[PDB]
Tab-separated table of C-alpha atoms in Angstrom:
chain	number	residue	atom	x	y	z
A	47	UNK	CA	0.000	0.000	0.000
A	48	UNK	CA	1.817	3.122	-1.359
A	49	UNK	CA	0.731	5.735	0.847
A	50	UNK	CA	-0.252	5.265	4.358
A	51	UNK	CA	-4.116	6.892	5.229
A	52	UNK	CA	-4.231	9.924	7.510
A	53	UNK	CA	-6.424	9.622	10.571
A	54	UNK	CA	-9.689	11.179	9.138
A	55	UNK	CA	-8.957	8.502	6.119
A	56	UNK	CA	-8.514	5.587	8.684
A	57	UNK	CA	-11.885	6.569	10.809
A	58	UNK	CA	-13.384	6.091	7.595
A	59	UNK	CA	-12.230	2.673	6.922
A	60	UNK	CA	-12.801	0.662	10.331
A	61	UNK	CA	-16.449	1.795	10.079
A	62	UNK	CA	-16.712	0.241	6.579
A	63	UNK	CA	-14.416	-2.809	7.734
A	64	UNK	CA	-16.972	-3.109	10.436
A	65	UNK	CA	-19.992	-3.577	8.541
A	66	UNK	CA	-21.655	0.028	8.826
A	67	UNK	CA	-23.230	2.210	6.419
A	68	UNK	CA	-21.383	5.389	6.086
A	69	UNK	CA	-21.250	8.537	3.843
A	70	UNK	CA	-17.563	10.317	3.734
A	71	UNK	CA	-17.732	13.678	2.691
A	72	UNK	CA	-15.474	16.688	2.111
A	73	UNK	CA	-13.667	19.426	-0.406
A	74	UNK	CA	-11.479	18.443	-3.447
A	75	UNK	CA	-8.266	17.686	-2.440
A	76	UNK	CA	-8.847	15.724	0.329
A	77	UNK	CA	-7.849	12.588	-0.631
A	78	UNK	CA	-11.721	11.279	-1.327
A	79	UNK	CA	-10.428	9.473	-4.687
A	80	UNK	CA	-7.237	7.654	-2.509
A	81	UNK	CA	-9.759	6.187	-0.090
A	82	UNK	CA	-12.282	5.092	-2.157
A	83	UNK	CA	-9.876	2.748	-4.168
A	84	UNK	CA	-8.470	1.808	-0.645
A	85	UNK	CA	-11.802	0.837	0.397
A	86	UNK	CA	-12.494	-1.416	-2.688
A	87	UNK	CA	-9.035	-2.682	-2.454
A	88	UNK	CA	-9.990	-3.463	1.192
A	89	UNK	CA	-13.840	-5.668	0.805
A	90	UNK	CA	-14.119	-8.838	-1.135
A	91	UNK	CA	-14.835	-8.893	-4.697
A	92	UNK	CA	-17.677	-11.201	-4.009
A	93	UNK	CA	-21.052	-9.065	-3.070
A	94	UNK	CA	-19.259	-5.471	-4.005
A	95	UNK	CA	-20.940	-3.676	-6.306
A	96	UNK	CA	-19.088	-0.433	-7.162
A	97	UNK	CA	-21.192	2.447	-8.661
A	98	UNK	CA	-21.476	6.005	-9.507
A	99	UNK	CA	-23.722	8.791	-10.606
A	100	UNK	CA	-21.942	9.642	-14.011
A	101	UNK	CA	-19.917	7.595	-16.634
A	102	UNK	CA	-16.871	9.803	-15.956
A	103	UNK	CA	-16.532	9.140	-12.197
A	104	UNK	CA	-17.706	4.908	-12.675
A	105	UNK	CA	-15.099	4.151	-15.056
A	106	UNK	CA	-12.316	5.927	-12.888
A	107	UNK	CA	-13.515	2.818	-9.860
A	108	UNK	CA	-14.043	0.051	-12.460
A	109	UNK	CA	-17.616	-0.362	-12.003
A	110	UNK	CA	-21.155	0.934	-13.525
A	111	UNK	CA	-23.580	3.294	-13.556
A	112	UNK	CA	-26.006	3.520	-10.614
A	113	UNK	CA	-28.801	3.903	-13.455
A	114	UNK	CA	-27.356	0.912	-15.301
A	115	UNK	CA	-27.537	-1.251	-12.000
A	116	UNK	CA	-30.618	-0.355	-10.951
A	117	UNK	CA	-32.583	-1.240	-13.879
A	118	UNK	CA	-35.891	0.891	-13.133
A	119	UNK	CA	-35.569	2.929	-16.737
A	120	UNK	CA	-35.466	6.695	-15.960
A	121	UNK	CA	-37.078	6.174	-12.173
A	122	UNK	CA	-40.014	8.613	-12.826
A	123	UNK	CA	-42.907	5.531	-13.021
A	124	UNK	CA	-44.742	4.252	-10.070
A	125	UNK	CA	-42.927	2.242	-7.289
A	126	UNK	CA	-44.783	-1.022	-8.825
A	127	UNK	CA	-43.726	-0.661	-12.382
A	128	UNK	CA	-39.946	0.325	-11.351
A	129	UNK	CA	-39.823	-2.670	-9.307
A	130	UNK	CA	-41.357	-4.691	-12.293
A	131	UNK	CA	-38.502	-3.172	-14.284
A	132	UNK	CA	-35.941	-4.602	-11.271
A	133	UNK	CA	-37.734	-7.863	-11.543
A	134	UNK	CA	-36.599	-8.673	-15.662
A	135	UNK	CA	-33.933	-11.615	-15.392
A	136	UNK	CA	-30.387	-10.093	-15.127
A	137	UNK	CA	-31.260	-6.885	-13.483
A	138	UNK	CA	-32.938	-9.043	-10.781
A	139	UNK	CA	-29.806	-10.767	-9.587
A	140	UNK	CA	-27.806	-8.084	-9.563
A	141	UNK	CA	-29.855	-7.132	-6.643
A	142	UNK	CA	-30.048	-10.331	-5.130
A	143	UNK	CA	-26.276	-10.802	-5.117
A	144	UNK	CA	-24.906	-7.102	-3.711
A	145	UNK	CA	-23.846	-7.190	-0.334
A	146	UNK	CA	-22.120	-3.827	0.075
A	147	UNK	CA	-22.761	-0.780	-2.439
A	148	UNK	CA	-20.444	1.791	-2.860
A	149	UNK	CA	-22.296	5.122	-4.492
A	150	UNK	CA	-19.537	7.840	-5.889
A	151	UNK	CA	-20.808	11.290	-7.018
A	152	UNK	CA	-23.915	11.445	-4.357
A	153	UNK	CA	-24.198	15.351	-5.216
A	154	UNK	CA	-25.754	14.006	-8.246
A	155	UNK	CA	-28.663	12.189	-7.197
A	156	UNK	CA	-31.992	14.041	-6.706
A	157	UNK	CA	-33.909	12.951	-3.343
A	158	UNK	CA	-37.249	11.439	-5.029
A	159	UNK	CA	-34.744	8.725	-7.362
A	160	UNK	CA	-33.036	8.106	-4.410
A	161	UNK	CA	-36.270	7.430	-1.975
A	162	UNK	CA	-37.660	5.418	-5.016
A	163	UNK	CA	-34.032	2.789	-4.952
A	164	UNK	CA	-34.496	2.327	-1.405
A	165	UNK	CA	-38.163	0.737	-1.778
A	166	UNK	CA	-37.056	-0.673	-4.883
A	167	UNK	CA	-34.340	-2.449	-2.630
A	168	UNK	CA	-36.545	-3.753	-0.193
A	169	UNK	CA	-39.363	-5.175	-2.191
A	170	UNK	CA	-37.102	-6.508	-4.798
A	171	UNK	CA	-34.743	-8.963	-1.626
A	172	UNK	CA	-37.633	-9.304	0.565
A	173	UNK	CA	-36.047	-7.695	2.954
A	174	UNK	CA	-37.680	-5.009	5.771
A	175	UNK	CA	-33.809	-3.657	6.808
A	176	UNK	CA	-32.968	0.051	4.845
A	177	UNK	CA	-32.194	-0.333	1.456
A	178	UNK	CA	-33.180	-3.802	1.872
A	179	UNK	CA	-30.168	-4.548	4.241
A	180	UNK	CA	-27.432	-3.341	1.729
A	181	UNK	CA	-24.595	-1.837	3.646
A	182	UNK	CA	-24.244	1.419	1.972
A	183	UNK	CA	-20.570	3.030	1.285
A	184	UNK	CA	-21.272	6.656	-0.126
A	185	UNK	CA	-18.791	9.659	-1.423
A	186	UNK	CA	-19.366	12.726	-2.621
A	187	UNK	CA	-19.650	16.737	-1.541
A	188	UNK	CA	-23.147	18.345	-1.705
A	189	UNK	CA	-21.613	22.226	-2.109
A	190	UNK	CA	-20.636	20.681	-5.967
A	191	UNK	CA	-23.354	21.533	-8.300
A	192	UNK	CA	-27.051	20.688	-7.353
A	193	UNK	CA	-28.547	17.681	-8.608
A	194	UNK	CA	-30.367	17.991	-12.034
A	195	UNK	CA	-34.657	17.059	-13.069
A	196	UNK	CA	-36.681	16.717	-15.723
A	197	UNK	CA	-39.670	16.941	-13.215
A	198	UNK	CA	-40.866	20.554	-13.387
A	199	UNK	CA	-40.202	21.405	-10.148
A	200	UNK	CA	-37.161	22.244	-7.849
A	201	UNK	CA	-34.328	19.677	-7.566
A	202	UNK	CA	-33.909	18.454	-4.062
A	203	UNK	CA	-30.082	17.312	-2.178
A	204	UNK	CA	-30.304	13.913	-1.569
A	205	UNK	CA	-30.027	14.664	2.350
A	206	UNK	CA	-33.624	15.688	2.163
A	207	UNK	CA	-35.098	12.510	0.912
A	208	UNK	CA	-37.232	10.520	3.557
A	209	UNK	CA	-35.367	7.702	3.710
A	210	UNK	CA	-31.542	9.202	4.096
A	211	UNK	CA	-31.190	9.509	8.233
A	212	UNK	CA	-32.909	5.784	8.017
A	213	UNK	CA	-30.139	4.746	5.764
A	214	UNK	CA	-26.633	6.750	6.534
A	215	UNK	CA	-26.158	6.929	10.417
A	216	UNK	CA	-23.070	8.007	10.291
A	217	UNK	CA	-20.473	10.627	8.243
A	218	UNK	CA	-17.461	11.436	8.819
A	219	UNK	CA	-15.393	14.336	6.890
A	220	UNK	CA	-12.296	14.422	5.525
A	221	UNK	CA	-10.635	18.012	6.124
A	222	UNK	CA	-6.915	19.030	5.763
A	223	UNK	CA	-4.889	18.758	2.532
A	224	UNK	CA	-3.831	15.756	1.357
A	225	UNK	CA	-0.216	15.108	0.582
A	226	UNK	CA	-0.844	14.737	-3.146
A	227	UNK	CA	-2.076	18.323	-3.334
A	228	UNK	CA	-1.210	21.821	-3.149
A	229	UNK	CA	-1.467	22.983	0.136
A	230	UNK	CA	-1.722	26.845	-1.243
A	231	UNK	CA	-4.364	25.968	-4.190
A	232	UNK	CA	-6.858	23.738	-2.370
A	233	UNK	CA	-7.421	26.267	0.707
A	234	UNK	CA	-8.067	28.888	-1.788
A	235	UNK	CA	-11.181	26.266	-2.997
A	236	UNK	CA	-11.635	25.367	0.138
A	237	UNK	CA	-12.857	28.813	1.251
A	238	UNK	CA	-14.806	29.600	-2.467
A	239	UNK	CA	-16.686	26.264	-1.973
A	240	UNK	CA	-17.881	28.091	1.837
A	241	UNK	CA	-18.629	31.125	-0.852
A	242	UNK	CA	-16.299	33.044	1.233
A	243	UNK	CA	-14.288	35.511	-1.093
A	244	UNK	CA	-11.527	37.758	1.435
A	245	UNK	CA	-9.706	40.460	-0.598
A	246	UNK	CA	-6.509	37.705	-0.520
A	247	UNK	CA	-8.416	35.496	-2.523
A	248	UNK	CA	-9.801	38.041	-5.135
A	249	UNK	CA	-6.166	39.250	-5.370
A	250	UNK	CA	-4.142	35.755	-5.601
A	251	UNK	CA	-7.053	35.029	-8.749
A	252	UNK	CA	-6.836	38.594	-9.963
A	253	UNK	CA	-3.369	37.559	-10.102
A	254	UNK	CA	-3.520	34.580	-12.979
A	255	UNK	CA	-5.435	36.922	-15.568
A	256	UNK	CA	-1.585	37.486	-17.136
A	257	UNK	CA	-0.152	34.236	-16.553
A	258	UNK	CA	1.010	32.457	-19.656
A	259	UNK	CA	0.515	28.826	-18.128
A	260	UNK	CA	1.664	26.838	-21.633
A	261	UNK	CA	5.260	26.341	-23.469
A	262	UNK	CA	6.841	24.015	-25.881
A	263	UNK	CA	3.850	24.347	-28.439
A	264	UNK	CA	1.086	23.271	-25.465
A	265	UNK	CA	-1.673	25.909	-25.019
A	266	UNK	CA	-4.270	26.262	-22.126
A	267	UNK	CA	-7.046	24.165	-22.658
A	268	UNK	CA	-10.721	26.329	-22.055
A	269	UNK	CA	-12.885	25.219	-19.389
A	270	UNK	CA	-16.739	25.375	-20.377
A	271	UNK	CA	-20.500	24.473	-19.079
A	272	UNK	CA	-21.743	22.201	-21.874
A	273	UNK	CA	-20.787	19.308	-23.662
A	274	UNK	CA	-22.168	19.593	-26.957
A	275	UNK	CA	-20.445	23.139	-27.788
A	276	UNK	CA	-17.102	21.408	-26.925
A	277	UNK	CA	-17.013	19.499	-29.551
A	278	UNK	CA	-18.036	21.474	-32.127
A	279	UNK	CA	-14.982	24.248	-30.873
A	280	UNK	CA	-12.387	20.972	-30.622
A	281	UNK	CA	-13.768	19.845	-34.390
A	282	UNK	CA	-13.214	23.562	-36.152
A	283	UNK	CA	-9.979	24.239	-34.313
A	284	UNK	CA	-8.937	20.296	-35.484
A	285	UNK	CA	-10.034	21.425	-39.487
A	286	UNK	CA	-7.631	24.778	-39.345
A	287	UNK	CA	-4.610	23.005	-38.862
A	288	UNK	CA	-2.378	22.267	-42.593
A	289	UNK	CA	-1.713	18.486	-41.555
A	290	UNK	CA	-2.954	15.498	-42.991
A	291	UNK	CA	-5.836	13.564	-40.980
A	292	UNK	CA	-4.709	10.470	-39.096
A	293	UNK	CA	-7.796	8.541	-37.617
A	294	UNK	CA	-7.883	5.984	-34.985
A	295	UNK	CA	-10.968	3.345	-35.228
A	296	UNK	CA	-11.856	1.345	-31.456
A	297	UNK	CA	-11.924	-1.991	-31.487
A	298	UNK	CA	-15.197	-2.806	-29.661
A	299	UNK	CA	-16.611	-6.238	-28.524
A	300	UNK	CA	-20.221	-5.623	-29.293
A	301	UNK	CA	-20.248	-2.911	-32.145
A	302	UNK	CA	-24.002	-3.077	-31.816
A	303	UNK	CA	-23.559	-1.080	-28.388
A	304	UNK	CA	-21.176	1.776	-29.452
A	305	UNK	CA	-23.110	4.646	-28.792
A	306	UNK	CA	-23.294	3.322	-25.376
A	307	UNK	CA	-19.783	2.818	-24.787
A	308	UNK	CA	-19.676	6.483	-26.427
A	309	UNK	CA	-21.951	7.758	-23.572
A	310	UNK	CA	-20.294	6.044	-20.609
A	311	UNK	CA	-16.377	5.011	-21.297
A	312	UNK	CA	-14.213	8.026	-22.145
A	313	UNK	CA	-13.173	7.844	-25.671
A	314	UNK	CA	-15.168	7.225	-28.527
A	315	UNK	CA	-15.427	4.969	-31.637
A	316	UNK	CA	-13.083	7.085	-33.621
A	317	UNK	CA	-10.392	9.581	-32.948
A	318	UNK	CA	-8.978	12.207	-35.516
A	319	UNK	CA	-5.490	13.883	-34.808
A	320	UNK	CA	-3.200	16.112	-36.872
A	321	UNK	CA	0.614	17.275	-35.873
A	322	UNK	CA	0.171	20.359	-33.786
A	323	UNK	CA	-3.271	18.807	-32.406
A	324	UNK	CA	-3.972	20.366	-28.745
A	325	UNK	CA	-4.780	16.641	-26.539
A	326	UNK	CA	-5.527	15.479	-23.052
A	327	UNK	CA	-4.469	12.005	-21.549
A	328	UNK	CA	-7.660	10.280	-20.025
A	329	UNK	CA	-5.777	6.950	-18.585
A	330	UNK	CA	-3.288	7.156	-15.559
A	331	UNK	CA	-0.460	5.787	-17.671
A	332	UNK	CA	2.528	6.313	-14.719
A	333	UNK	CA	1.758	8.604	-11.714
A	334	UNK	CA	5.315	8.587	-10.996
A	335	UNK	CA	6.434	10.744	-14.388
A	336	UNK	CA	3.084	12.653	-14.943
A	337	UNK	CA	1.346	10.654	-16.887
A	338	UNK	CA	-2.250	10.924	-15.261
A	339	UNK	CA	-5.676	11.607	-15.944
A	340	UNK	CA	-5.726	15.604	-17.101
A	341	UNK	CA	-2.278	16.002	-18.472
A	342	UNK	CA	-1.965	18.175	-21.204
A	343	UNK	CA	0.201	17.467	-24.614
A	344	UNK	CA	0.489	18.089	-28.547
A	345	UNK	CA	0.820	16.111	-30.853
A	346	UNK	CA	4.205	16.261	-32.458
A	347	UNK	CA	4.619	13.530	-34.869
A	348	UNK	CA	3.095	9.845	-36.074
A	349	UNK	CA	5.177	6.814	-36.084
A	350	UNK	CA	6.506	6.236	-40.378
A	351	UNK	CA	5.181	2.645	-40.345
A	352	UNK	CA	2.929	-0.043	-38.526
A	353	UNK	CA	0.033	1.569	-36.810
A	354	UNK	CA	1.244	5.299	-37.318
A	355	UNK	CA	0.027	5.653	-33.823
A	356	UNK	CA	1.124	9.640	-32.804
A	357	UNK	CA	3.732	10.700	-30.484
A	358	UNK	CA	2.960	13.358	-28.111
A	359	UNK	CA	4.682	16.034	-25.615
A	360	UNK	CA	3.418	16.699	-22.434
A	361	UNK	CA	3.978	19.773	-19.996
A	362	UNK	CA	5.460	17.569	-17.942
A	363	UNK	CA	8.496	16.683	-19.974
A	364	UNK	CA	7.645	12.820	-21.447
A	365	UNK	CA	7.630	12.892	-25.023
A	366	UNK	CA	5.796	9.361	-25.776
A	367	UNK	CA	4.005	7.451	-28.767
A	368	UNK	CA	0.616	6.477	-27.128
A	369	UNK	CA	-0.957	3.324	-27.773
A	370	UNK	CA	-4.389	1.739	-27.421
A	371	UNK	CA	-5.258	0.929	-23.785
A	372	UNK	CA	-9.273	-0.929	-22.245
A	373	UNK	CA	-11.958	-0.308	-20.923
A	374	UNK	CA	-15.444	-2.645	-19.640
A	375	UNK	CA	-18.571	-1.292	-19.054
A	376	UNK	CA	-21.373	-3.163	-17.685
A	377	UNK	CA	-24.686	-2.866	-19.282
A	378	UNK	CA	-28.377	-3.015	-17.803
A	379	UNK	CA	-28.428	-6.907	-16.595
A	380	UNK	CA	-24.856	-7.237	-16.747
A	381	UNK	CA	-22.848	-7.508	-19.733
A	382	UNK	CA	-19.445	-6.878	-20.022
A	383	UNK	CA	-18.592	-4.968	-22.939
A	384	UNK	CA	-14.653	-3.552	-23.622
A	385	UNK	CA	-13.655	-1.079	-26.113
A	386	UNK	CA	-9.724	-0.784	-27.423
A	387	UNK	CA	-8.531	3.006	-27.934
A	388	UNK	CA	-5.955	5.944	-27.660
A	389	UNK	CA	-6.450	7.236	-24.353
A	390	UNK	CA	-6.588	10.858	-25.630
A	391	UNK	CA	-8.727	13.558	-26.190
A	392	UNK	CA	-9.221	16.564	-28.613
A	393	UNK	CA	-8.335	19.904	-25.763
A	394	UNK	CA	-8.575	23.274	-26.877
A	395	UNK	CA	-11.754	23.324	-24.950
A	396	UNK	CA	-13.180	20.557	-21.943
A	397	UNK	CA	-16.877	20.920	-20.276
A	398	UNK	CA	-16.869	20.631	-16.314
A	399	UNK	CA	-19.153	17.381	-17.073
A	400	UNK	CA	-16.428	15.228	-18.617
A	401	UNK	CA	-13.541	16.773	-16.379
A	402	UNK	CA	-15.105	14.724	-13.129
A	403	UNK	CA	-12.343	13.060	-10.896
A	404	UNK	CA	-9.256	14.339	-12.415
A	405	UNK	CA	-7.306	18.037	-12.575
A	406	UNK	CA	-5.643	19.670	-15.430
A	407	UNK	CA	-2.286	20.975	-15.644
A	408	UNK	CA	-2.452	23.651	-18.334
A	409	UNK	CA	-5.836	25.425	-18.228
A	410	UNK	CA	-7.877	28.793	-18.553
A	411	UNK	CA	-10.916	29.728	-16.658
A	412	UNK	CA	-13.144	32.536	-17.172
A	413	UNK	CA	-15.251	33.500	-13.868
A	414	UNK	CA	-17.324	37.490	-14.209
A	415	UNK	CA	-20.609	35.852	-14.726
A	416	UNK	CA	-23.256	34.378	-11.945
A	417	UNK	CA	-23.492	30.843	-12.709
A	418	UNK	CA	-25.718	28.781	-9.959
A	419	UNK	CA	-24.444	27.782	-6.544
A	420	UNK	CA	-21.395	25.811	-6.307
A	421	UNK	CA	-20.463	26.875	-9.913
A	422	UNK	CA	-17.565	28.878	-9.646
A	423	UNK	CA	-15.782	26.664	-7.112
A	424	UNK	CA	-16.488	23.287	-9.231
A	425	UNK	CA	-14.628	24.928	-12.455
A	426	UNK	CA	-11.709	26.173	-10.180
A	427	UNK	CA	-11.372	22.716	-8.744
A	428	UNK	CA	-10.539	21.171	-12.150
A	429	UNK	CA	-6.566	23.036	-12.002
A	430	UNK	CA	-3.970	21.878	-9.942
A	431	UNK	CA	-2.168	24.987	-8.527
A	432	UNK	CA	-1.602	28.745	-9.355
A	433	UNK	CA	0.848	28.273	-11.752
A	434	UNK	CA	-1.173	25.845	-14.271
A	435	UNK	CA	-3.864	28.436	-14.161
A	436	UNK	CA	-4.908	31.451	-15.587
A	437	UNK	CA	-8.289	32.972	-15.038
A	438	UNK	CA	-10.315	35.789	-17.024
A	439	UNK	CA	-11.838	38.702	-15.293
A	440	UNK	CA	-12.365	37.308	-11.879
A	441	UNK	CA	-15.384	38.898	-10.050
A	442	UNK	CA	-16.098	37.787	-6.478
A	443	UNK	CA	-19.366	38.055	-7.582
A	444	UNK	CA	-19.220	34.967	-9.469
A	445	UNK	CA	-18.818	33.391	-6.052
A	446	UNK	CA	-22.451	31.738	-4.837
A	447	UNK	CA	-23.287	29.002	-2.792
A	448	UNK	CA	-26.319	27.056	-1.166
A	449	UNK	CA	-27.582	28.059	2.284
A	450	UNK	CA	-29.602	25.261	3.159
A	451	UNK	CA	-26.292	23.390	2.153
A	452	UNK	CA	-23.904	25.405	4.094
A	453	UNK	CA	-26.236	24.660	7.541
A	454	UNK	CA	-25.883	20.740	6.742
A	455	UNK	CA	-22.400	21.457	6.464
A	456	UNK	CA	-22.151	23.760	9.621
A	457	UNK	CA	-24.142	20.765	11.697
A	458	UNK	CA	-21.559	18.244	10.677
A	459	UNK	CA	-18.672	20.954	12.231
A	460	UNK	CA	-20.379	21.347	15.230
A	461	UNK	CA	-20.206	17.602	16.124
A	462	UNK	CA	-16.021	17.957	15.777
């Protein structure tokens, strides 16, 4: 074991080593990721089912979607025909069989879908416990965004559904630094995610707006809100370049699936790069030299023969041809498909939503609008320090969080 846990880590671990249902809680940078995988490194195999909100975040923990395990379609029909949809032959056992279910990105889940699992749970095993007995192993940090509906009205945290005191009797936070981080950076975002903005902060931001954060042909990548407007920006900056097209086709196990694998794994069925293309690696390839999830290259040149596969320079000094790496997904009653591909992606722009779980080491940030609560510190959270980041017009006014949040947060403190 690499790294030894601090003590608000450890707490964390006995609980779950002792059978209870817990939810661990606290800003980036506090080692959430580090315990999580220590966690499932920790629990059999056998009866673990590992899950999480998005596709981002359950690929990073080898495991699914909490939609895809569930089974109940979109959640939004009555209790009866959800647990009908639960009932159909592979989803069933899948319930059955889990033992222990660990639930990443919590933040994410609105309190109605999760109040409609835990019935699902217990008519489904037969079982009167909470959440049908399952011990319950939960992460996440409810000052990120809020949760998201279709249902017309407001969204509401999961910590307001019926069912959650029932469920979670304990959490525990996790609160200084962790030694993987910068101390400097993260108690910057650890005050913005409060929405506390002191005249230091606005200054050390203020402070970035001239930085030049790229060399050696690598540019700062631009952080946006939506997904779709990405890749339209990575597409026309791809066509201006002089270079020939190189593309990269996945090798897929069940080509009949590929949108899903699309939708949920992080690279798609075909990649396009040029020389002078602006990337991002999306596999940790070596921790130890810099190759992680979020670090920023260009592509500088393709191999003459074989494969042509391209050879890229990072930031942080590997020049490297990159080859195709794997990843499963499980489908809706329990499939395992795999799909073969670069672990790259186009980078002169990145949404928030498909930045979850890692930080980027070359990036620009623009922050004088009012976005909604939690906004402002979610987008600063995707850099790693000062000197990787530059942001645009910086207004402390930008800065807005959720009061009913904050007191759930302040009641936590108060108990140590």
């Amino acid at each position: 074991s690499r790294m030894q846990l601090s003590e608000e880590q450890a707490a964390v671990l006995r609980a779950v080593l002792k059978g209870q249902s817990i939810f661990f809680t606290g800003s980036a940078g506090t080692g959430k990721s580090y315990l999580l995988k220590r966690i499932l490194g920790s629990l059999p195999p056998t009866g673990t089912v590992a899950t999480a909100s998005t596709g981002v975040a359950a690929c990073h923990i080898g495991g699914t979607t909490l939609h895809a395990f569930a089974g109940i379609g979109s959640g939004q029909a009555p209790l009866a025909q959800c647990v009908a949809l639960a009932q159909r032959p592979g989803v069933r056992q899948g319930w059955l069989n889990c033992q222990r279910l660990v639930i990443d990105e919590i933040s994410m889940v609105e309190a109605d879908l999760f109040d409609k699992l835990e019935a699902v749970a217990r008519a489904v095993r037969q079982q009167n416990k909470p959440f049908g007995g399952i011990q319950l192993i939960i992460c996440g940090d409810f000052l990120q965004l809020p949760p998201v509906t279709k249902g017309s009205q407001p969204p509401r945290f999961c910590f307001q559904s019926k069912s959650w005191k029932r469920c979670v009797p304990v959490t525990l936070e996790l609160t200084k630094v962790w030694r993987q981080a910068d101390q400097t950076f993260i108690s910057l975002l650890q005050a913005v995610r409060l929405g506390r903005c002191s005249d230091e902060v606005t200054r050390q931001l203020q402070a970035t707006a001239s930085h030049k954060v790229g060399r050696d042909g690598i540019v700062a990548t631009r952080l946006c809100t939506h997904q779709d407007d990405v890749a339209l920006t990575n597409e026309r900056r791809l066509q201006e370049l002089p270079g020939k097209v190189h593309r990269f086709e996945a090798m897929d196990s069940n080509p009949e699936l590929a949108s899903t694998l699309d939708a949920q794994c992080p690279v798609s069925q075909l990649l396009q790069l040029k020389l002078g293309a602006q990337v991002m690696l999306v596999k940790n390839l070596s921790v130890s030299r810099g190759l992680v999830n979020g670090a920023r290259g260009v592509v500088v040149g393709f191999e003459a023969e074989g494969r042509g596969l391209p050879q890229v320079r990072f930031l942080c000094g590997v020049t490297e041809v990159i080859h195709a790496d794997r990843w499963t997904v499980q489908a809706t009653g329990g499939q395992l498909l795999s799909r073969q591909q670069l672990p790259l992606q186009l980078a002169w722009a990145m949404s928030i939503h498909k930045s979850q779980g890692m930080t980027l080491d070359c990036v620009e940030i623009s922050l004088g609008r009012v976005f909604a609560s939690g906004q402002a510190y979610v987008a600063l959270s995707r850099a790693r320090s000062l000197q990787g980041l530059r942001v645009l017009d910086f207004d402390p006014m930008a800065v807005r969080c959720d009061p009913r949040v904050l007191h759930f947060y302040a009641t936590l403190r108060r108990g140590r």
